[PDB]
Nucleic acid binder design. Structure first.
Lengths: 98, 103, 78, 98, 98, 77, 96
DNA sequence: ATCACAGGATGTACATATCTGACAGCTGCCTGGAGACTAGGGAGTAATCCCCTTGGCGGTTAAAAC
DNA sequence: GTTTTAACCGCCAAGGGGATTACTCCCTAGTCTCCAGGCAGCTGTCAGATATGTACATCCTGTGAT
């Protein structure tokens, strides 16, 4: 009768990224749930690190610099530098557009 | 026009911004912070999905299953370090047999 | 007396997945005790989470939160 | 004379089989009963979702497999190929659970 | 003649508690710093646990019961029950007063 | 400068840990382990300092670096 | 007069478990910290308290590692710690 | 007389055909994200101070090296 | 046990920069309106699970042999 209350997940974005990296490969429901949980966990980790960074520096705003430092502190080695490059590219493009 | 399209990202910049605002992390959230976080999340997802797709193709499968994700995570050194204390359901373990136990 | 439900073949299979080639006969009682302690901790945290929510049903999310609190994050259950 | 594999071929075969597979190794009903019996000591008349029991079983099996890998490493350190309770105790003491 | 900035610490309250539990006993500066760091760490732990408890239940207010659940989750057994007893007694007295 | 952690210093550290007999190859392994641990902690501390736009590594930076690695240290703020 | 091989080891164990002062010399450890930090950022300065905290953390970590290594050595029916004991301890801990 | 093959037995990887149910795509809609403004204070920047970090230097001896 | 050396301590000196204060501006919270991106719901169909028979892979013991 009544539709279930909507529950937001990262399924469609993960599917788009998968189609970008593997046009012919699909994904199962359990794997999609695992990917969604991974995204949530990484988001929580980075956001908590950025919040702690802002608190340590007596700042009231989380900006690109705080997230970038959180990424450098949380991701190991090549993952950190590649994520930094991708994020700086995205921020530069976003500020270049509007 | 979505903020994800401006940054050339597939992850939702607006949803990340709303979660940052409503996540009790700071009094204010910058404009570029959700863009940067969405880019990082998209990159990590792309890395794991690429490795999992490689594993699936190596196992003659076209759909990624938890076993492929577990293999991808534990075969990549940095990804294994990032998810060291993370358990993937139905992922199993790697085929590792100690050399002393072999015949 | 449900700890005996974790039979010797189950512990042997778990050891084989862990790479054990030869198992002593006293391993099973120790494994059962360790499993009981671990389940006691996780279930205690899960029941605490459920009681705080004023619920009578232990949910998967409660178990996930309990595992995360103990540094044993689980993927695939929300 | 009936065929008999030597004591250790079948063990290695089991190791390979259970490392290739991903299904749960403990029977579902006994584990559910054990969970309910343990939970009885914390709160009476508790109900459990199926996903909760599945997650508990997954976590318990992962923890037991990791503990058994550590136990095997400890037993190999002692120049043995047989795991003993002292190996488990040493592994749990080094991990910091005792 | 530049006066140093005000740095808040739990030193006076820890000293009062020490005089309550041990009248003829002192505390060094390093031990006082260690106790202050312990108080800060426990405060952060309990506050974070209460915050995630509120977020999980989709609540916006940290109340006495959230802190109680955080204490029950974070403290080991008898410490937890005695802390809960002390907290409930203090809250009851505060409510009774005004 | 890793050689500045002399053999008697490692022996003293082992004695505090209850070690009675020490092999001759322990010292290089201990130096390597200490170098790795210090590299990780110092990298995190320098990251914290750089985020603060400071040029002096403070005790709070080291404390935060240790706390991030699950090694909370009391007595320094 | 000569003590038997192990009396002085036990005496030192008791002495250093009674004591609480740092066991590594301050200047070599400070030089090692500066050398390690040089690879991360140049012209870096350090507070004295920062180096003291680093020394305390490093010594506590090494003492715990040596305790685990001693336990590993005892497990192998030995009284001498070996590099394989340290490697086993770090592998069980989840560091290598 | 102790050591390579011979061959038998067992298991497992490998085509091949059915079938099914779970995954991928289409649809309606509604709620959350985007556009367009204003207010205000959080933060960027400049000036200053002093303190606290760094550098040096000689003597002692405890500790390191052998 | 003997020989060497640099850690430590006390002292002095210079200045780099951490911390503070003032100012100001522009970036984000807040609000209103609007619309379309994403979510629940169906639904079809093909990827994989399930037999099923078969071709090796491998193990193990007898046995001939140099």
């Amino acid at each position: 009768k009544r539709r279930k209350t909507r529950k937001e997940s990262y399924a469609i974005y993960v599917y788009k990224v998968l189609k970008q990296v593997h046009p012919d490969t699909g994904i199962s429901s359990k794997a999609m749930s695992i990917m969604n949980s991974f995204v949530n966990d990484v988001f929580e980790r980075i956001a908590g690190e950025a919040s702690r960074l802002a608190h340590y520096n007596k700042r009231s705003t989380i900006t690109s610099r705080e997230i970038q430092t959180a990424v450098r502190l949380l991701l190991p080695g090549e993952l950190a530098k590649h994520a930094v490059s991708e994020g700086t590219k995205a921020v530069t493009k976003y500020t270049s557009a509007k | 026009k979505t903020r994800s399209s401006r940054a050339g990202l597939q992850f939702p910049v607006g949803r990340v911004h709303r979660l940052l605002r409503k996540g009790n992390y700071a009094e204010r959230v910058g404009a570029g912070a959700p863009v940067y976080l969405a880019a990082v999340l998209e990159y990590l997802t792309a890395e794991i999905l690429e490795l999992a797709g490689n594993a699936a193709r190596d196992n003659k499968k076209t759909r990624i299953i938890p076993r492929h994700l577990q293999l991808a995570v534990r075969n990549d050194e940095e990804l294994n370090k990032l998810l060291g204390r993370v358990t993937i359901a139905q992922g199993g373990v790697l085929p590792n047999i100690q050399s002393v136990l072999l015949p | 007396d449900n700890i005996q439900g974790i039979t010797k073949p189950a512990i042997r299979r778990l050891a084989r997945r862990g790479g054990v080639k030869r198992i002593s006969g006293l391993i099973y009682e120790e494994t059962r005790g360790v499993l009981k302690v671990f389940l006691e901790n996780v279930i205690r945290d899960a029941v605490t989470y459920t009681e705080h929510a004023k619920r009578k049903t232990v949910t998967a999310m409660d178990v996930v939160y309990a595992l995360k609190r103990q540094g044993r994050t689980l993927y695939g259950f929300g | 004379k009936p065929h008999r594999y030597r004591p250790g071929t079948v063990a290695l075969r089991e190791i390979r089989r259970y490392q290739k597979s991903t299904e749960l190794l403990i029977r579902k009903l006994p584990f559910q009963r054990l969970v309910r019996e343990i939970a009885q000591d914390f709160k009476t008349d508790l109900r459990f979702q199926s996903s909760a029991v599945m997650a508990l079983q997954e976590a318990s099996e992962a923890y037991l497999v990791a503990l058994f890998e550590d136990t095997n490493l400890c037993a190999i350190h002692a120049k043995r190929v047989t795991i003993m309770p002292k190996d488990i105790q040493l592994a749990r003491r080094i991990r910091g659970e005792r």
